[PDB]
């Protein structure tokens, strides 16, 4: 008869806990770039968690940093889906 | 590429 | 009626809902935070993407920590009775649990608490989506060959 006050939140983090998140000054951030691409391609097809998993794969596989600074060069990123949702979420209906 |  | 299943959020309310995009590019000099070149590309991409999903998008640029909290407070008290969902996108500097306004940090918990099931009754039972492009610390992932 009650639901938790923390239920039905979804936190789509760009990066894992404790980690930097990468932004490209020309293309935008790796995560937002990939999120928009996957929403455009799959919002009429996939449930939201499966969209966000495609985002995880895109960011993990297609991006790698390039830096003149060895400390920041050749680095990778994985986003972090945090779901307290209680149902599947489709952006389309009917 | 830059960090946030 | 025939058999029914209830595994999916109801997303056929008259409106999909608000999409609040907070795009923090330029920070007060006194904070020592660098400008976030490329974030305007992100903000425009998100605006168009969520426009095509039929969200009522509001883009907000360069908000102080006080402006962020007031915007979240005000938005949580709007009439959401005809809206399926709520989306908020945060583009800023951050660290674990924290997002930065132009003049200082905001606890992420402070932002999301406005939409808690008990404090925002017209979003109770509706999906509340927070999309966060911000650092969560200073670790770097060296990766591993496949
Ligand atoms: Na990113």
H helices present in A1-94, as ranges:
30-42, 48-62
C residues 6-35 lying closer than 8 A (beta carbon) to A:
6-9, 11-12, 16
Bridge partners for C15 per DSSP: C83
What is the distance in A from the centroid of ligand 1 to the CA of A24? 8
The angstrom resolution of this structure is: 1.9
Decide if A14 contacts C127 (C-beta within 8 A). no
What is the widest separation between alpha-carbon atoms in chain B? 10
Is C142 tagged catalytic?
A: no
Q: Where are the domains of chain C?
A: 1-146
Please tell me the distance from the alpha carbon of residue C55 to that of residue C86, in angstroms, as a whole number. Answer: 9
Is C93 tagged catalytic?
A: yes
What is the widest separation between alpha-carbon atoms in chain C? 64
Please tell me the total number of residues recorded for chain B in this structure. 4
**Cβ contacts of B4 on chain C, cutoff 8 Å:** 36, 92-94, 133-135
Task: Tell which residue, A86, A79, A77, has the closest CA to residue A10.
Answer: A86
Task: Tell which residue, C79, C91, C93, C87, has the closest CA to residue C122.
Answer: C79
A65-92: b (≥16 Cβ within 10 Å) or e: beeeeeebeebbbbbbeeeebeeebbbe
Chain A: nearest CA to C53, how far in angstroms? 7
H/E run at residue C75 = helix C65-76
Helix then strand then coil, in percent of chain A rounded to 5, is 35, 20, 50
Task: Tell which residue, C81, C90, C78, has the closest CA to residue C130.
Answer: C90
Beta strands C83-91; C15-23: pairing state: parallel
Which domains does chain A show, CATH number per domain? 1-94 (3.30.70.1470)
**Cβ contacts of B2 on chain C, cutoff 8 Å:** 37-38
Could A93 and C11 be called an inter-chain contact, meaning their C-beta atoms sit closer than 8 Å?
A: yes
CATH class of C1-146: alpha beta
Could C94 and B4 be called an inter-chain contact, meaning their C-beta atoms sit closer than 8 Å?
A: yes
């Amino acid at each position: 008869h009650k639901i938790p006050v923390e239920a039905d939140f979804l936190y789509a983090y760009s990066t894992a806990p404790g980690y930097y998140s990468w932004r490209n000054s020309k293309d935008g951030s790796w995560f937002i770039q990939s999120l928009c691409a996957m929403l455009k391609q799959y919002a009429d097809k996939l449930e939201f968690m499966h969209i966000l998993t495609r985002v995880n794969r895109k960011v993990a596989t297609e991006f790698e940093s390039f830096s003149f600074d060895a400390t920041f060069h050749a680095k990778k990123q994985i986003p972090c889906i945090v779901s307290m949702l209680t149902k599947e979420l489709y952006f389309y209906h009917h | 590429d830059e960090v946030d | 009626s025939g058999i029914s299943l209830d595994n999916s959020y109801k997303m056929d309310y008259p409106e999909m809902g608000l999409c609040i995009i907070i795009n923090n590019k330029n920070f007060h000099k006194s904070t020592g935070m660098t400008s976030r070149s490329g974030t305007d590309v992100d903000a425009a991409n998100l605006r168009e993407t969520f426009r095509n999903l039929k969200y009522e998008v509001r883009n907000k640029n360069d908000l102080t920590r006080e402006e962020i909290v007031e915007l979240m407070r005000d938005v949580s008290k709007e009439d959401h009775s005809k809206r399926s969902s709520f989306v908020c996108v945060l583009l800023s500097h951050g660290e674990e649990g924290i997002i930065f306004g132009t003049n200082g940090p905001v606890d992420l918990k402070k932002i999301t608490n406005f939409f808690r099931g008990d404090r925002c009754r017209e979003l109770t039972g509706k999906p509340k989506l927070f999309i966060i492009q911000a650092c969560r610390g200073t670790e770097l992932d060296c990766g591993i060959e496949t």
